[PDB]
Amino acid sequence: DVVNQNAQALNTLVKQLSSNFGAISSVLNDILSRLDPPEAEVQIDRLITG
Amino acid sequence: DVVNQNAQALNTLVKQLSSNFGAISSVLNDILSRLDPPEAEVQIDRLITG
Amino acid sequence: KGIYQTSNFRVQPTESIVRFPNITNLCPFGEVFNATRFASVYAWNRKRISNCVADYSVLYNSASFSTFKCYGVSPTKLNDLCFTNVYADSFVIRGDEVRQIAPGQTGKIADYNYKLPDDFTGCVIAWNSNNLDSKVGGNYNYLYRLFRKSNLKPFERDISTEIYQAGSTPCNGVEGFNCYFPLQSYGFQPTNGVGYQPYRVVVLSFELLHAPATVCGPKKSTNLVKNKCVNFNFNGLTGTGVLTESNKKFLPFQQFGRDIADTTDAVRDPQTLEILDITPCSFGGVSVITPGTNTS
Amino acid sequence: SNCVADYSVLYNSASFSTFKCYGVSPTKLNDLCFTNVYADSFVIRGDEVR
Amino acid sequence: QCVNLTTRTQLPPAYTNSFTRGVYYPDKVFRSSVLHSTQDLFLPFFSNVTWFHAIHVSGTKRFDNPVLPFNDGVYFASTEKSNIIRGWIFGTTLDSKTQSLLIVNNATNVVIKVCEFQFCNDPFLGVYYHKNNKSWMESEFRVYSSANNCTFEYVSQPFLMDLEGKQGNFKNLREFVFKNIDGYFKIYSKHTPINLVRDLPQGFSALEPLVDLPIGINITRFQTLLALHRSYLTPGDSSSGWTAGAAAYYVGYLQPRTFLLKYNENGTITDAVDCALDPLSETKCTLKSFTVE
Amino acid sequence: CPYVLGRXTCLXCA
Ligand SMILES: CCCCCCCCCCCCCCCCCC(=O)O
Ligand SMILES: *[C@@H]1O[C@H](CO)[C@@H](O)[C@H](O)[C@H]1NC(C)=O
Ligand SMILES: *[C@@H]1O[C@H](CO)[C@@H](O)[C@H](O)[C@H]1NC(C)=O
Ligand SMILES: *[C@@H]1O[C@H](CO)[C@@H](O)[C@H](O)[C@H]1NC(C)=O
Ligand SMILES: *Cc1nc(C*)nc(C*)n1
Prior knowledge:
The structure is cut from a larger assembly and holds five copies of chain A and one copy of chain F. Chain A is mainly α. Chain A contains three helices and no strands. Helix content of chain A is 64%, strand content 0%. The two termini of chain A are 28 Å apart. Chain F has no helices and no strands. The radius of gyration of chain F is 6 Å and the shape is globular. Bound molecules: stearic acid, 2-acetamido-2-deoxy-beta-D-glucopyranose (3 copies) and 2,4,6-tris(chloromethyl)-1,3,5-triazine.
């Protein structure tokens, strides 16, 4: 159970990188290649907080 | 004390639904009846985060 | 004295790579923005744009756009991107109704003639056309839908000419008292004040970085290097990593591949249709053992 | 007070150049009721409309 | 010209089970060896789908082309052996007062048009069997009486299309999903080789995306266009002297549902969970696993 | 004018 809980916590941490957290996307590179530094700053701030 | 702590935690969780969390309101339906889904979505995201 | 963790071992990119599809023709800027005739707003014209380079700098000699507003994309990024399916919606409105060609807007044009979706990705372009669409006796060839029983859905076109029942007596297919024709003529004159003058509107709609793209900006493609940490630009999608050969079998409607974290880890190269796997260059933790800065 | 806010009858003869709502989306204006309605009317020049 | 058919035998409508069909690819993004959850307009698992026949026992005679609602999208399944279902009609009032979408296969091209068609009450296509040449040649195309003031047109490349009225088993299953969102008519499709006599078979097939048409019209009703057969063995006038080749089609309706799709190692969707079917499937979607302990 | 004042697409004329 200890090994299962630790592996599940790490895999949940990996899988939580797919969330948007209220931003337009979950990929940093997709945000950076479609927006100028101001609106990219807003969306990356949302992703950073999440 | 254990019973009172659990009941107080549940009542605090219920009473925290009245907070605005930086949005324009605390009611979901009042936000949804005054705003289109673009301008509603920011307030709903604030309530969701809170 | 002790052992301390530090930043993980990172490798910097060596060069930059741009991979765009082989497209030579320019996009029909003359056919879209310099057409001889424009459609009415109730019968707005939709044109499909494909297999070309969006070099809008050639518009700089003869555009003079008064309204240019993009929604899903910053304008300064427009030269560095690729667009999957591009549609141009062309019509003519009044000068006062240009503000109704924004999403989430109300008004006669936004409700009965032309509506934009709430999630709209694209750019609205509008310019004054008083020197083209106005004549001295009055140009009445541009129509708008004044009467309708309900609001239009987004990107819906209504070309019906059924007689509108404005009161309580039924119309029986004929016009008369409280029974009006739904289409009405714009009155365009050169002596009209601004806001009563004709405006040509082109709305470009596209979808970005999720499908294979065919319209691309004026970026020169470079050579494809592998097995090295590089900065890549695949069809407008930028990033950093090592590109290697892949055994992934992409379906013909697919361009990108994603893992469990929903980051792009596979791509189809647009020039030579081969599948590449993207792997980040930074890997491996680093610790430092010291006997103390005071000691040594 | 005591009237129906059917602004579609303005579509015949108004031709507004500036229309900006602040506490409410325009598309929600047909679905709401309004309590303390006041209209402030005046005349300025164009450069002060902003 | 519009011909109202006769000699139809009236039977009550039939219904069957959709099982685990109607699943399509939600996006154009490759995923492999993953369990991906997404919400979209899906046909629910084990849905009551409507069953329509084209048969001439000779002795019931069924030629089913009714006008059905469109709702939030349509799942269409066709079990055929010899090329009876040729296309569909989408619209609201299906006359000259509104704009309507024709999708048809007239045995030479695929025609997709968006016009104000004055549609017939009984629209159909026709194949004539020639005894003197042992050939099946297309003769009739009675879908609309007029088409005026219209915007979207598409004609595909020409082809030679087999029209012999074969007998035996239903050999081909063709599944489609039609959606009408934001002025876009999205068509998803998949074809499967089958061998069965009747009813909709159980099984899984992921419908790959076919097309998105920018039609920009209002769609509430739809109607399937079938092809009948005429020969020397079926005498009479145009209204009565006809027969129907055997075919079946199945209609279901999509609603907003959350599905859990399974991408295998090659990137093909091979299984799915409908999270709102029963609490077992809700537990499956919460666990992100198909197996429950 | 395509129509007279009050009729057709010229309802809002004069
Ligand atoms: C002919 C239509 C081509 C469509 C290409 C896809 C969209 C890519 C961006 C194109 C921008 C449109 C022109 C913008 C010109 C801006 C000039 C100005 O601000 O004065
Ligand atoms: C679509 O058609 C139906 C039936 O004709 C009608 O009730 C509905 O209002 C139409 N939709 C729009 C947006 O006009
Ligand atoms: C076919 O039937 C419809 C409805 O019964 C009728 O309106 C139409 O006139 C008929 N057409 C012919 C050719 O009989
Ligand atoms: C099928 O339709 C196309 C498009 O109208 C036409 O060119 C062709 O001749 C038709 N073929 C037959 C057999 O009717
Ligand atoms: C000549 C003309 N035409 C229309 C439609 N309207 C007016 C007022 N005048």
